[PDB]
Amino acid sequence: MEAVLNELVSVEDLLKFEKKFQSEKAAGSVSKSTQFEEAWCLVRSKYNDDIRKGIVLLEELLPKGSKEEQRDYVFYLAVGNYRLKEYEKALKYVRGLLQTEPQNNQAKELERLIDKAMKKDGLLEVLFQ
């Protein structure tokens, strides 16, 4: 995934989804699925306000989800909080997921990323003192 290509296709996908979302909203029916896909987009944003909106949407969905749905909601709540540098919140979400699925390799890897960031592992200023 060439990075500039990735940005390009992401926009094409966004416009197609926007079309679908606006059509659904106009019809009076924004489903749990489409709301999740909205959140999935938002937590990938370069803008913090977008990520926070995605978190709000996922927290709203969380109590209404099946076990299977909640797995995805909690994963992306951990991701979203991680990207906002809300590490304590991110760790609580991912540790909850690992309670349900201790051998989820993706959740294990995310917990490692959060932990490392929290502890400032690979902070560079230390290397130059």
Side-chain angles (χ1 to χ4, degrees):
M1 91 256 126
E2 176 176 40
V4 168
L5 182 58
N6 198 7
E7 289 288 294
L8 188 166
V9 302
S10 289
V11 176
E12 184 75 3
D13 289 350
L14 175 64
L15 295 182
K16 172 174 70 193
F17 177 66
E18 177 180 3
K19 200 161 186 291
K20 173 185 159 186
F21 180 95
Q22 288 293 339
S23 177
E24 223 181 288
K25 168 185 141 140
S29 60
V30 182
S31 72
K32 296 160 109 222
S33 174
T34 296
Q35 281 190 284
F36 174 74
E37 293 162 3
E38 182 192 357
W40 179 102
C41 295
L42 286 166
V43 297
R44 289 173 161 69
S45 184
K46 58 191 166 190
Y47 294 101
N48 292 337
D49 286 349
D50 283 343
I51 306 174
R52 293 207 191 264
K53 179 58 179 173
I55 287 167
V56 169
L57 293 174
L58 291 167
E59 293 185 323
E60 296 188 315
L61 289 168
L62 182 59
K64 318 173 155 180
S66 65
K67 184 168 189 191
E68 176 97 299
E69 291 168 332
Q70 291 181 321
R71 156 186 170 135
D72 296 334
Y73 299 158
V74 168
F75 180 80
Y76 275 110
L77 281 162
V79 168
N81 279 293
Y82 171 69
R83 296 194 67 228
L84 289 170
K85 308 184 164 55
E86 293 278 6
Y87 301 127
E88 147 173 66
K89 290 189 194 59
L91 193 66
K92 289 178 180 176
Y93 276 122
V94 77
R95 285 176 170 185
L97 180 54
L98 284 165
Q99 285 177 321
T100 71
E101 345 193 318
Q103 288 313 120
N104 177 329
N105 290 314
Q106 295 65 55
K108 288 202 289 182
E109 287 177 4
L110 178 56
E111 180 191 43
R112 186 182 314 258
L113 284 178
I114 296 158
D115 172 74
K116 284 176 38 175
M118 234 164 88
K119 292 175 167 51
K120 292 202 159 62
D121 291 349
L123 185 74
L124 300 186
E125 63 193 67
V126 168
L127 304 181
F128 303 125
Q129 176 161 357

